[PDB]
Write an enzyme that holds these catalytic residues in place. Structure first.
Site, PDB file in Angstrom:
ATOM      1  CG  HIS A  53      14.066  -9.031  16.284  1.00 48.71           C
ATOM      2  ND1 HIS A  53      13.849 -10.196  15.569  1.00 48.71           N
ATOM      3  CD2 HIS A  53      13.501  -9.220  17.499  1.00 48.71           C
ATOM      4  CE1 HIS A  53      13.202 -11.055  16.334  1.00 48.71           C
ATOM      5  NE2 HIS A  53      12.982 -10.490  17.511  1.00 48.71           N
ATOM      6  CB  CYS A 104      15.782 -13.370  14.261  1.00 50.04           C
ATOM      7  SG  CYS A 104      14.238 -13.011  13.406  1.00 50.04           S
ATOM      8  CB  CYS A 154      17.276 -10.801  11.952  1.00 52.87           C
ATOM      9  SG  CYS A 154      16.398  -9.810  13.187  1.00 52.87           S
ATOM     10  N   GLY A 210      -1.315 -18.639  14.682  1.00 50.59           N
ATOM     11  CA  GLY A 210      -0.303 -19.484  14.077  1.00 50.59           C
ATOM     12  C   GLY A 210       1.002 -18.793  13.761  1.00 50.59           C
ATOM     13  CG  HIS A 252       5.961 -12.356   9.249  1.00 52.60           C
ATOM     14  ND1 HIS A 252       6.495 -12.665  10.487  1.00 52.60           N
ATOM     15  CD2 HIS A 252       5.087 -13.352   8.954  1.00 52.60           C
ATOM     16  CE1 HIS A 252       5.942 -13.782  10.933  1.00 52.60           C
ATOM     17  NE2 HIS A 252       5.092 -14.220  10.021  1.00 52.60           N
ATOM     18  CG  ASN A 280      -1.066 -14.874  11.171  1.00 53.43           C
ATOM     19  OD1 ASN A 280      -2.273 -14.661  11.296  1.00 53.43           O
ATOM     20  ND2 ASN A 280      -0.549 -15.511  10.129  1.00 53.43           N
TER      21      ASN A 280
HETATM   22  N1  LIG Z   1      12.662 -19.213   4.598  1.00 51.40           N
HETATM   23  C1  LIG Z   1      11.491 -18.663   4.194  1.00 51.40           C
HETATM   24  N2  LIG Z   1      11.365 -17.910   3.067  1.00 51.40           N
HETATM   25  C2  LIG Z   1      10.202 -17.359   2.670  1.00 51.40           C
HETATM   26  N3  LIG Z   1       9.058 -17.508   3.352  1.00 51.40           N
HETATM   27  C3  LIG Z   1       9.050 -18.222   4.512  1.00 51.40           C
HETATM   28  C4  LIG Z   1      10.296 -18.843   5.000  1.00 51.40           C
HETATM   29  N4  LIG Z   1      10.023 -19.485   6.143  1.00 51.40           N
HETATM   30  C5  LIG Z   1       8.707 -19.302   6.388  1.00 51.40           C
HETATM   31  N5  LIG Z   1       8.141 -18.565   5.412  1.00 51.40           N
HETATM   32  C6  LIG Z   1       6.725 -18.164   5.394  1.00 51.40           C
HETATM   33  O1  LIG Z   1       6.549 -17.244   6.464  1.00 51.40           O
HETATM   34  C7  LIG Z   1       5.169 -17.239   6.778  1.00 51.40           C
HETATM   35  C8  LIG Z   1       5.051 -17.169   8.273  1.00 51.40           C
HETATM   36  O2  LIG Z   1       3.751 -16.655   8.504  1.00 51.40           O
HETATM   37  P1  LIG Z   1       3.071 -16.689   9.943  1.00 51.40           P
HETATM   38  O3  LIG Z   1       2.198 -17.910   9.981  1.00 51.40           O
HETATM   39  O4  LIG Z   1       2.258 -15.408   9.824  1.00 51.40           O
HETATM   40  O5  LIG Z   1       4.150 -16.654  11.002  1.00 51.40           O
HETATM   41  C9  LIG Z   1       4.526 -18.489   6.181  1.00 51.40           C
HETATM   42  O6  LIG Z   1       3.619 -18.125   5.134  1.00 51.40           O
HETATM   43  C10 LIG Z   1       5.718 -19.281   5.662  1.00 51.40           C
HETATM   44  O7  LIG Z   1       5.423 -20.035   4.480  1.00 51.40           O
HETATM   45 ZN   LIG Z   2      14.381 -10.708  13.599  1.00 48.59          ZN
END
Ligand SMILES: Nc1ncnc2c1ncn2[C@@H]1O[C@H](COP(=O)(O)O)[C@@H](O)[C@H]1O
Ligand SMILES: [Zn+2]
Ligand SMILES: Nc1ncnc2c1ncn2[C@@H]1O[C@H](COP(=O)(O)O)[C@@H](O)[C@H]1O
Ligand SMILES: [Zn+2]
Lengths: 111, 111
Positions: free
Chosen positions: A45, A3, A6, A90, A97, A84
């Site tokens: 997780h 993950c 993680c 999305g 998170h 989300n």
């Molecule tokens: N490696 C990363 N570091 C920091 N933020 C990330 C990373 N990968 C994805 N994201 C962010 O994680 C969020 C995922 O949000 P969601 O659409 O709620 O799943 C998005 O705003 C992405 O820009």
């Molecule tokens: Zn995880």
């Protein structure tokens, strides 16, 4: 082992760290949609909000409390918290998170 | 006596009710920004997420759990949960309310 969040939480994949403790890890979104855009994750997780149970609901309350402490510090003028769940929202990474968004008067537009 | 959402929760001001129990009250947003747009409030008056404390964090976890139960039922294809704190987030009513949004592939636009 698998993950992305993680691994970020264990500093196995890099991030710009905002806060961490034994339970949570907060870092800057690398593709922000607001001038302040922070992600707050539990280190453990949990795939999505749909995995909250009567038995872990107190823990998720503590995570949300810590979300508020981060938000009120980083965003004294106000902030939005977003979570989300699944495809229509999305949700990309299947590790829960919370988005903390702020730093401007945030839009409220049709989705 | 004074809070619009306290009064809605006690059915002193009308709403289209989605769910209620001894602790929470959920109803349709009258100015929706998505095809499914539900507000979930505690019946008890808590002004915003900034009023969460270590001592009521378990209760807010239970509220979020019930938010997930409502969301997974009303929005099986996925849903977004939003909470607004203070001026930059555009918080209107100072009684904590979770937005459940769904019913389409929801936009993710700059705020
Ligand atoms: N490696 C990363 N570091 C920091 N933020 C990330 C990373 N990968 C994805 N994201 C962010 O994680 C969020 C995922 O949000 P969601 O659409 O709620 O799943 C998005 O705003 C992405 O820009
Ligand atoms: Zn995880
Ligand atoms: N009387 C009402 N019944 C149902 N929804 C309402 C009512 N008054 C305000 N709202 C909604 O409450 C929400 C307030 O959200 P916020 O901007 O997070 O404070 C908005 O989406 C409004 O459309
Ligand atoms: Zn109230």
């Amino acid at each position: 082992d698998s993950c992305i969040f993680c691994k970020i939480a264990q500093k196995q994949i890099p991030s710009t760290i905002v806060y961490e403790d034994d339970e949570i890890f907060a870092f800057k979104d690398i593709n922000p949609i607001a001038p302040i855009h922070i992600l707050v994750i539990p280190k453990q997780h949990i795939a999505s909000l749909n995995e909250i149970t009567e038995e872990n609901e107190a823990f998720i309350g503590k995570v949300l409390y810590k979300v508020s402490l981060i938000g009120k510090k980083e965003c004294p003028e106000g902030y939005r918290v977003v979570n989300n769940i699944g495809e229509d929202a999305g949700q990309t990474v299947k590790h829960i998170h919370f988005h903390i968004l702020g730093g401007k008067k945030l839009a409220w537009d049709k989705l």
